Amino acid sequence: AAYSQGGGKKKVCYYYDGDIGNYYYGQGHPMKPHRIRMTHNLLLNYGLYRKMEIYRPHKATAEEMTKYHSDEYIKFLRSIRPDNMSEYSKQMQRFNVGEDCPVFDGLFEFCQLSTGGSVAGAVKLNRQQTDMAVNWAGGLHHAKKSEASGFCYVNDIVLAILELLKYHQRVLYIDIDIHHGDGVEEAFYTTDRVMTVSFHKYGEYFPGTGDLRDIGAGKGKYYAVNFPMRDGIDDESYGQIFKPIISKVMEMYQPSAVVLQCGADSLSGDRLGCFNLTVKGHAKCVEVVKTFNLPLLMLGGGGYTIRNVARCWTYETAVALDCEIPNELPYNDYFEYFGPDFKLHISPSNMTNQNTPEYMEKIKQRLFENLRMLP
Amino acid sequence: XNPKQXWG
Ligand code: NA
Ligand code: NA
Ligand SMILES: [Zn+2]
């Protein structure tokens, strides 16, 4: 196979459970698993199922989850229900459930399906049976070893990376959610076998971590990379730092597999976010990573203006497939959600970009200094 | 991370 030049269309395996959209976090809660069903239905109506393999994930077992999470926390998640909450008030506080991370009907099953897609995708990659695996129900990057955080309960990303590490010496994690990928970075902070790269809003903003001076520790020193940003970053600003940083990371770290969290709360108009990317600017990140021709697990994450989440992950599936799709949306079960325009692509707002071009270049220059410290 | 409620 010495003739390979690393191009070609890529084999894509996509994971989805038709039950996922029915899980409900509660009245007024911004996290809406329904957006995954909206994404699926939109990409079915564009015909993208003709171009990829579609799999229904298994329900990951408590035991699969305790490859990272503590036994006590997973036992709690398996046991807690809206009808027995009163008896668990102490454990709810200890594991940080019942505020941002509510108890809801089927919580554990939702975690099992989110996680099952990511671990199943990792196995498929390890078996060299696909180039890309996609799980838009995964990417729940804030969950910690023994606590929920940030609408995330089980860290499917950490579990998928642990699976990749069975066959890959070095794994690269890239996080374009507007929030810092703190749960993933914490899990791998002291190893060089996982490099974590997060771009995120930083300053009076959840979760409060991801300073560019957070670079890892011990054998993991220089293997955590954080790009802190201000409100209002736009396509042009993002694209001028993302490809140079990822290219330098690829050059210095030479990973053999990549996990890309595609949290869509970095889009213009997100309910919780303060960035100004379009779907095209967000998806340029997938294009950039895809060109390195490494085994790639693409995951979901945040995204709280759900019409735009469905647009984003539909277009990023098309990008993974190297399929052009029209801007005019096909009819679909959720067509009214996409008015008044009924187009796939979105316009940025007139919000001010507080990330000056000088700020962007200066942060990039500082991270390049840290990347020079790899062997 | 919800501005409308809590500390996240
Ligand atoms: Na991020
Ligand atoms: Na690391
Ligand atoms: Zn987020």
Coordinates of C-alpha atoms and ligand atoms in Angstrom, one line a residue:
Chain A
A1 CA 0.0 0.0 0.0
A2 CA 3.1 2.2 -0.3
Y3 CA 1.2 4.2 -3.0
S4 CA -1.1 5.9 -0.5
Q5 CA -1.0 9.7 -0.4
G6 CA -3.4 10.1 2.5
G7 CA -6.3 11.5 0.5
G8 CA -9.5 9.9 -0.7
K9 CA -12.9 10.0 0.7
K10 CA -13.1 8.6 4.2
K11 CA -15.1 5.7 5.6
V12 CA -17.6 7.0 8.2
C13 CA -19.5 5.0 10.9
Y14 CA -22.3 6.9 12.6
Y15 CA -23.9 6.0 16.0
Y16 CA -27.4 6.9 17.0
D17 CA -30.2 5.5 19.2
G18 CA -33.8 6.6 18.2
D19 CA -34.7 6.7 21.9
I20 CA -32.1 9.5 22.7
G21 CA -34.4 12.4 21.8
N22 CA -37.0 11.4 24.5
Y23 CA -34.7 12.0 27.5
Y24 CA -35.8 15.3 29.2
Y25 CA -33.6 17.2 31.6
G26 CA -36.5 19.2 32.9
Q27 CA -38.6 22.4 32.4
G28 CA -36.4 25.3 31.3
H29 CA -33.2 23.2 31.3
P30 CA -31.0 24.3 28.3
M31 CA -29.7 20.8 27.5
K32 CA -32.1 19.1 25.1
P33 CA -31.3 15.6 23.8
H34 CA -34.0 16.2 21.3
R35 CA -31.4 18.2 19.3
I36 CA -29.7 14.8 18.5
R37 CA -33.0 13.5 17.0
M38 CA -33.3 16.8 15.0
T39 CA -29.8 16.3 13.7
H40 CA -30.5 12.7 12.7
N41 CA -33.8 13.6 10.9
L42 CA -32.2 16.4 9.0
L43 CA -29.3 14.4 7.8
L44 CA -31.6 11.5 6.8
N45 CA -33.7 14.0 4.8
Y46 CA -30.5 15.2 3.0
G47 CA -29.9 11.5 2.1
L48 CA -26.5 11.3 3.9
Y49 CA -27.4 7.8 5.1
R50 CA -26.6 6.6 1.6
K51 CA -23.0 7.5 2.2
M52 CA -22.2 6.1 5.7
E53 CA -22.8 3.1 7.9
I54 CA -25.4 3.8 10.7
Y55 CA -25.2 1.8 13.9
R56 CA -27.2 1.8 17.1
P57 CA -24.9 1.9 20.1
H58 CA -25.2 -0.6 22.9
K59 CA -26.0 0.6 26.4
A60 CA -22.6 0.8 28.1
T61 CA -22.5 -1.1 31.3
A62 CA -21.7 0.2 34.8
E63 CA -18.5 -1.8 34.5
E64 CA -17.5 -0.1 31.2
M65 CA -18.0 3.2 33.0
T66 CA -15.9 2.3 36.0
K67 CA -12.8 2.0 33.7
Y68 CA -12.6 5.7 34.7
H69 CA -15.4 6.7 37.1
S70 CA -15.5 5.6 40.8
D71 CA -17.6 2.6 41.7
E72 CA -19.6 4.7 44.2
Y73 CA -20.5 7.4 41.7
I74 CA -21.6 4.9 39.0
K75 CA -23.7 3.0 41.6
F76 CA -25.4 6.3 42.5
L77 CA -26.2 7.1 38.9
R78 CA -27.7 3.7 38.5
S79 CA -29.8 4.0 41.6
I80 CA -31.1 7.7 41.7
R81 CA -34.5 8.5 40.3
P82 CA -37.0 11.3 40.7
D83 CA -39.1 9.1 43.0
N84 CA -36.3 8.3 45.5
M85 CA -34.5 11.7 45.4
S86 CA -35.6 12.6 48.9
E87 CA -33.7 9.6 50.4
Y88 CA -30.5 10.6 48.5
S89 CA -30.2 14.3 49.4
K90 CA -26.7 13.8 50.8
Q91 CA -25.4 11.8 47.9
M92 CA -26.9 14.3 45.4
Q93 CA -24.8 17.0 46.9
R94 CA -21.6 14.9 47.0
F95 CA -21.9 13.9 43.4
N96 CA -23.1 17.3 42.2
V97 CA -26.5 16.2 41.0
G98 CA -29.8 18.1 41.4
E99 CA -29.0 21.6 40.2
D100 CA -27.2 22.1 36.8
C101 CA -27.2 18.3 36.5
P102 CA -30.7 17.2 37.4
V103 CA -32.2 13.9 38.2
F104 CA -34.5 12.9 35.4
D105 CA -36.4 9.8 34.3
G106 CA -33.9 7.5 32.5
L107 CA -30.8 9.4 33.5
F108 CA -28.7 6.3 33.7
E109 CA -29.9 5.0 30.3
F110 CA -29.2 8.3 28.7
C111 CA -25.6 8.0 30.1
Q112 CA -25.4 4.4 28.8
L113 CA -26.4 5.4 25.2
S114 CA -24.2 8.5 25.2
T115 CA -21.2 6.5 26.3
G116 CA -22.0 3.4 24.3
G117 CA -21.8 5.4 21.0
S118 CA -18.4 6.8 21.9
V119 CA -16.8 3.5 23.1
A120 CA -18.3 1.6 20.2
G121 CA -16.8 4.2 17.8
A122 CA -13.4 3.8 19.5
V123 CA -13.6 0.0 19.2
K124 CA -14.4 0.3 15.5
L125 CA -11.4 2.6 15.0
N126 CA -9.2 0.3 17.0
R127 CA -10.3 -2.6 14.7
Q128 CA -9.2 -0.5 11.7
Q129 CA -12.7 -0.9 10.3
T130 CA -13.5 2.8 9.8
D131 CA -11.6 6.1 9.2
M132 CA -14.1 8.2 11.2
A133 CA -16.7 7.3 13.9
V134 CA -19.4 9.9 14.8
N135 CA -21.4 10.0 18.0
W136 CA -23.3 13.3 18.3
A137 CA -24.8 12.1 21.6
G138 CA -21.3 12.0 23.2
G139 CA -18.8 14.7 23.9
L140 CA -19.9 15.2 27.5
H141 CA -16.6 16.8 28.4
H142 CA -17.2 18.2 31.9
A143 CA -18.0 15.0 33.8
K144 CA -15.4 14.1 36.4
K145 CA -14.3 10.8 38.0
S146 CA -16.7 11.1 40.9
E147 CA -19.1 13.9 40.1
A148 CA -21.4 15.4 37.4
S149 CA -20.7 18.8 36.0
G150 CA -21.9 21.1 33.3
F151 CA -24.9 18.9 32.2
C152 CA -22.5 15.9 31.9
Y153 CA -22.6 12.8 34.1
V154 CA -20.5 10.1 32.5
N155 CA -17.4 11.3 30.6
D156 CA -17.8 9.3 27.4
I157 CA -14.8 11.0 25.9
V158 CA -12.4 9.8 28.7
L159 CA -13.8 6.3 28.3
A160 CA -13.4 6.4 24.5
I161 CA -9.8 7.6 24.9
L162 CA -9.0 4.8 27.4
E163 CA -10.3 2.4 24.7
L164 CA -8.1 4.0 22.0
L165 CA -5.1 3.8 24.3
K166 CA -5.2 0.0 24.1
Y167 CA -4.0 0.3 20.5
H168 CA -2.6 3.8 20.2
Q169 CA 0.5 5.1 21.9
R170 CA -0.5 8.8 21.6
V171 CA -4.1 10.2 21.3
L172 CA -4.9 13.8 20.5
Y173 CA -8.1 15.4 22.0
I174 CA -9.3 18.7 20.5
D175 CA -12.3 20.6 22.0
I176 CA -14.1 23.4 20.1
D177 CA -17.0 23.6 22.6
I178 CA -17.1 27.2 23.9
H179 CA -16.4 25.8 27.4
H180 CA -13.0 24.5 28.5
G181 CA -12.8 20.7 28.3
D182 CA -11.9 20.4 31.9
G183 CA -13.0 16.8 32.6
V184 CA -10.9 15.4 29.8
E185 CA -7.9 17.5 30.6
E186 CA -8.1 16.5 34.3
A187 CA -8.2 12.8 33.4
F188 CA -5.0 13.0 31.3
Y189 CA -3.2 16.0 32.9
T190 CA -0.2 13.9 34.1
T191 CA 0.3 11.6 31.1
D192 CA 2.0 12.3 27.7
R193 CA -0.1 9.5 26.1
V194 CA -3.0 12.0 25.7
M195 CA -2.5 15.6 24.6
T196 CA -5.6 17.7 25.2
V197 CA -6.2 20.9 23.2
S198 CA -9.1 23.2 24.2
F199 CA -10.2 26.5 22.6
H200 CA -12.8 28.2 24.9
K201 CA -14.1 31.5 26.3
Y202 CA -12.1 32.3 29.4
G203 CA -12.9 34.9 32.2
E204 CA -16.0 34.9 34.4
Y205 CA -17.2 31.9 32.6
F206 CA -17.9 28.2 33.3
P207 CA -16.0 26.2 34.3
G208 CA -13.3 28.7 35.3
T209 CA -10.3 26.6 34.2
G210 CA -8.3 26.6 30.9
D211 CA -5.8 29.3 31.5
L212 CA -3.1 29.2 28.9
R213 CA -0.6 28.7 31.8
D214 CA -2.3 25.3 32.5
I215 CA 0.1 23.1 30.5
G216 CA 0.0 19.7 32.3
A217 CA 2.0 18.3 35.1
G218 CA 4.7 15.6 35.6
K219 CA 5.1 13.4 32.6
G220 CA 2.2 15.3 31.1
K221 CA 3.9 18.7 31.3
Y222 CA 3.5 20.4 27.9
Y223 CA 0.7 18.0 26.9
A224 CA -2.2 20.2 27.8
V225 CA -2.8 23.2 25.6
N226 CA -5.4 25.9 26.3
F227 CA -6.4 28.8 24.1
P228 CA -8.4 31.3 26.2
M229 CA -10.7 33.6 24.2
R230 CA -13.0 36.6 24.8
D231 CA -16.5 37.2 23.6
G232 CA -17.4 37.5 20.0
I233 CA -14.8 35.5 18.1
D234 CA -15.7 35.2 14.5
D235 CA -14.9 32.8 11.6
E236 CA -11.9 34.7 10.4
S237 CA -10.3 35.1 13.8
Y238 CA -10.9 31.4 14.7
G239 CA -9.7 30.0 11.4
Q240 CA -6.4 32.0 11.6
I241 CA -5.4 30.3 14.8
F242 CA -7.0 26.9 14.6
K243 CA -5.1 25.5 11.6
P244 CA -1.7 26.8 12.7
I245 CA -2.0 25.4 16.2
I246 CA -3.4 22.0 15.2
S247 CA -0.7 21.7 12.4
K248 CA 2.0 22.5 15.0
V249 CA 0.5 20.0 17.4
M250 CA 0.3 17.3 14.7
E251 CA 4.0 18.0 13.8
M252 CA 5.3 17.9 17.4
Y253 CA 3.1 15.3 19.0
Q254 CA 2.5 12.9 16.1
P255 CA -0.7 11.3 17.5
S256 CA -2.0 8.0 16.0
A257 CA -5.6 8.7 16.8
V258 CA -7.7 11.9 17.3
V259 CA -10.9 12.7 19.2
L260 CA -12.6 15.9 18.2
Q261 CA -15.4 17.3 20.4
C262 CA -17.6 19.5 18.2
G263 CA -19.7 21.3 20.9
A264 CA -21.9 23.7 19.0
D265 CA -22.3 26.3 21.7
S266 CA -19.4 28.2 20.0
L267 CA -21.9 29.2 17.3
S268 CA -23.4 32.7 16.9
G269 CA -26.7 33.0 18.7
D270 CA -26.2 30.1 21.2
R271 CA -28.4 30.4 24.2
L272 CA -25.5 30.0 26.6
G273 CA -22.5 31.0 24.5
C274 CA -21.0 34.3 23.5
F275 CA -19.1 33.5 20.3
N276 CA -20.0 34.5 16.8
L277 CA -19.0 31.5 14.5
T278 CA -21.1 30.4 11.6
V279 CA -21.7 26.7 10.8
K280 CA -19.1 27.1 8.1
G281 CA -16.5 28.5 10.5
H282 CA -17.2 25.8 13.0
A283 CA -17.0 23.0 10.4
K284 CA -13.7 24.4 9.0
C285 CA -12.3 22.8 12.2
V286 CA -13.5 19.4 11.1
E287 CA -12.1 19.9 7.6
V288 CA -8.7 20.8 9.1
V289 CA -8.5 17.8 11.4
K290 CA -9.9 15.5 8.7
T291 CA -7.0 16.3 6.3
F292 CA -4.4 14.7 8.6
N293 CA -5.9 11.3 7.7
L294 CA -5.7 9.8 11.2
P295 CA -8.4 7.6 12.9
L296 CA -10.9 10.2 14.1
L297 CA -13.7 10.0 16.6
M298 CA -16.1 13.0 16.2
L299 CA -18.4 13.8 19.1
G300 CA -21.1 16.2 20.1
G301 CA -21.1 18.3 23.2
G302 CA -22.7 21.6 24.1
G303 CA -25.1 23.5 21.9
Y304 CA -28.2 25.2 23.3
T305 CA -29.9 26.9 20.3
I306 CA -31.1 23.7 19.0
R307 CA -32.0 24.6 15.4
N308 CA -28.4 25.7 14.9
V309 CA -27.0 22.6 16.6
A310 CA -28.9 20.4 14.1
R311 CA -27.6 22.6 11.2
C312 CA -24.0 22.4 12.6
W313 CA -23.8 18.6 13.1
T314 CA -25.7 17.9 9.9
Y315 CA -23.2 20.0 8.0
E316 CA -20.2 18.5 9.9
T317 CA -21.5 15.0 9.0
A318 CA -21.6 16.1 5.3
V319 CA -18.0 17.4 5.7
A320 CA -16.8 14.1 7.1
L321 CA -18.4 12.5 4.1
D322 CA -17.0 15.0 1.6
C323 CA -20.6 15.4 0.4
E324 CA -21.9 18.8 -0.7
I325 CA -25.4 19.4 0.4
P326 CA -27.7 22.4 -0.6
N327 CA -28.2 25.4 1.5
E328 CA -32.0 25.0 1.0
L329 CA -33.2 22.7 3.8
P330 CA -35.1 19.6 2.8
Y331 CA -38.5 19.0 4.4
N332 CA -38.1 17.2 7.7
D333 CA -40.0 16.4 10.9
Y334 CA -38.8 19.6 12.5
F335 CA -39.0 21.9 9.5
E336 CA -40.7 24.7 11.4
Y337 CA -37.7 25.0 13.8
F338 CA -35.6 26.3 11.0
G339 CA -37.6 29.4 10.0
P340 CA -37.9 32.1 9.1
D341 CA -35.2 31.3 6.5
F342 CA -35.2 27.5 6.2
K343 CA -31.6 27.5 5.2
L344 CA -28.7 25.3 6.5
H345 CA -26.1 28.1 6.9
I346 CA -26.3 30.9 9.5
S347 CA -25.3 34.5 9.5
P348 CA -23.1 36.0 12.3
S349 CA -24.4 38.7 14.5
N350 CA -23.1 42.3 14.7
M351 CA -21.6 41.6 18.2
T352 CA -18.2 43.0 18.8
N353 CA -15.2 40.7 18.6
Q354 CA -13.2 41.4 21.7
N355 CA -10.4 39.1 20.5
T356 CA -8.2 41.5 18.7
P357 CA -6.0 40.2 16.0
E358 CA -3.0 41.1 18.1
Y359 CA -4.4 39.1 21.1
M360 CA -5.0 36.1 18.9
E361 CA -1.4 36.2 17.5
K362 CA 0.1 36.7 20.9
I363 CA -1.7 33.8 22.5
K364 CA -0.7 31.6 19.5
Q365 CA 2.9 32.7 19.8
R366 CA 2.9 31.7 23.5
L367 CA 1.4 28.3 22.8
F368 CA 4.0 27.8 20.0
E369 CA 6.7 28.3 22.6
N370 CA 5.2 25.6 24.7
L371 CA 4.9 23.2 21.8
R372 CA 8.7 23.7 21.1
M373 CA 9.3 21.9 24.5
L374 CA 8.0 18.5 23.2
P375 CA 10.8 16.0 22.4
Chain B
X1 CA -23.0 27.5 32.5
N2 CA -26.4 28.6 32.7
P3 CA -26.5 32.4 33.2
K4 CA -30.2 32.2 34.3
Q5 CA -29.5 29.9 37.2
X6 CA -26.8 28.8 39.7
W7 CA -23.1 29.2 39.4
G8 CA -22.3 27.3 36.1
Ligands
NA1 NA -13.4 24.0 24.2
NA2 NA -2.0 14.9 28.9
ZN3 ZN -20.2 24.0 26.3

